[PDB]
Amino acid sequence: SGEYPTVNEIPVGEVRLYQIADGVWSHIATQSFDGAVYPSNGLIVRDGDELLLIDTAWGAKNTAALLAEIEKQIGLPVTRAVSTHFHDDRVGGVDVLRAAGVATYASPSTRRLAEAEGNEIPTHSLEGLSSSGDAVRFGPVELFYPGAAHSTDNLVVYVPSANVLYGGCAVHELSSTSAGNVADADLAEWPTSVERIQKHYPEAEVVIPGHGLPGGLDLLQHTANVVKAHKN
Numbered sequence: 001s002g003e004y005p006t007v008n009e010i011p012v013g014e015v016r017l018y019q020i021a022d023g024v025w026s027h028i029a030t031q032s033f034d035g036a037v038y039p040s041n042g043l044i045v046r047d048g049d050e051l052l053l054i055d056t057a058w059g060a061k062n063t064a065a066l067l068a069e070i071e072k073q074i075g076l077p078v079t080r081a082v083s084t085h086f087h088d089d090r091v092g093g094v095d096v097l098r099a100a101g102v103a104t105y106a107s108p109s110t111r112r113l114a115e116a117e118g119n120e121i122p123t124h125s126l127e128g129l130s131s132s133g134d135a136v137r138f139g140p141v142e143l144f145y146p147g148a149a150h151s152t153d154n155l156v157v158y159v160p161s162a163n164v165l166y167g168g169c170a171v172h173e174l175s176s177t178s179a180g181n182v183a184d185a186d187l188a189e190w191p192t193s194v195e196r197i198q199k200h201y202p203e204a205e206v207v208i209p210g211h212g213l214p215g216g217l218d219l220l221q222h223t224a225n226v227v228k229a230h231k232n
């Protein structure tokens, strides 16, 4: 009924949308992994009379539910999707998207890592993102590679029309105590990568983490803090 939806409010298999700004939504779903339930976010950006999707809803059935929820609440076709790193909360559901006619994209690094992990593999490679600080335009967003953080391949997404920064899993929510799932992370480089994001997007008004509640620019410094406390 208005506030941002939390993990215990979304049964596994249902998807919520949340209006972030004009023409910008987040999508929220929940999934089981190793016997615990987690929420996760993605993004939807209006692209004329089409939509750009950022990240799957963490699984095939969740992603089918996402497409149905978009049709119900927005009613414009999803034509392209970008996955922001190789984990299943970002690519699980790419096969559903591809069979629904959505063109799926990721960096070559993400595609290689997804293939090696046994995860679903986006079809198209996004060049121009291999060096930290690189940025490319993709429809109504800018894609930015900040350097290694949560994963070596993680991308962030900026919506310039709305000053919305989608940090993905390189950014944690303010209530977070922990650095999340760090299995593939670079804890030493992560603060430097966050500093790059801070320098590149100083006018961000909304910052969306990969998991949990959006906030403002403070999510960036908070993330650096939680990662440094973890590494130590």
Ligand SMILES: CC(C)c1cccc2c(-c3ccc(CNC(=N)N)c(F)c3)c(C(=O)O)[nH]c12
Pocket (backbone or CB within 6 Å): 007, 033, 038, 039, 087, 088, 089, 150, 169, 176, 178, 179, 180, 181, 182, 210, 211, 212
């Ligand atoms: C590898 C991938 C598919 C995956 C599986 C299971 C958990 C995670 C997490 C995670 C783990 C705990 C928290 C703490 N917050 C809570 N609500 N439990 C959090 F935010 C994310 C991340 C992440 O870190 O990207 N990724 C995950």
Ligand SMILES: [Zn+2]
Pocket (backbone or CB within 6 Å): 085, 087, 150, 151, 169
């Ligand atoms: Zn991840």
Ligand SMILES: [Zn+2]
Pocket (backbone or CB within 6 Å): 087, 089, 169, 210, 211
């Ligand atoms: Zn994640």
